[PDB]
Write a protein that binds this ligand. Sequence first.
Ligand SMILES: [Zn+2]
Length: 198
Amino acid sequence: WVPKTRLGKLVVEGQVASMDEAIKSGLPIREPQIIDMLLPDLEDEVLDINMVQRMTDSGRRVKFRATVIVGNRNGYVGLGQAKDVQVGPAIRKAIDAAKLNITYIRRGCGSWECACGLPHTVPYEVTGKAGSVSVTLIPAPRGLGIAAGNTATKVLEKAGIKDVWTKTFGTTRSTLNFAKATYDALNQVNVVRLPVYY
RNA sequence: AUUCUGGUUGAUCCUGCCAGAGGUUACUGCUAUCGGUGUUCGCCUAAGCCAUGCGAGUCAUAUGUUCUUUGUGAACAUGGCGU
Ligand SMILES: [Zn+2]
């Protein structure tokens, strides 16, 4: 594998080992073959195989919009989807796109009933809205599980979040918007302004 | 577990209901060994109609009469209480 950008040269030199220092570098993480060495423990799951099509003069174009979400079950998770003529190349392109979009989300115990403080649930209440699908990340008591959907359980188990209550608004049929709104909520987890004394 | 899934599209987002998925209640198809707990089994139609037995009777230290199995034993009556 030939690194191409400055981040690839830095990771091949050994200066950047984990993705946190790469994000601290501030450069664009464009090569899919950098995060695999930075995080060899990356895991992902295909979230749907919804087969799109398209109209032509003679026949009908066919593609696959398979989406795969990537996390590490510790506090890092990312979103990524891709399409191509075959399910294999489509899912592999989605895996390439997802690993470039991994982010670090800080976690704790902000539940009204839970009082542990050790990171097992969302730090506080946040929202994720991709399309009309919206998800609120209300904290949950420890040792309880995710009070969300099956794809929500997959995405939040990839992201490392353990116990959460949620709620869904709008047309929840689109699994792609469900994954993207969960991503938006997790990104709003670590963007709200916290007190300096906390 | 403060839960989603399919359906309108050539394909998407979506409003929108439809249907899926869990209780409980009533009834019921199929079907079947047993015990425990108690505060269920003609309510939902007919508060329709009823054969049969029965469900409130008791009082000898209230009065009165005949027996005896001689004893707060029974039968009758007036009467008290209760129904
Ligand atoms: Zn806790």
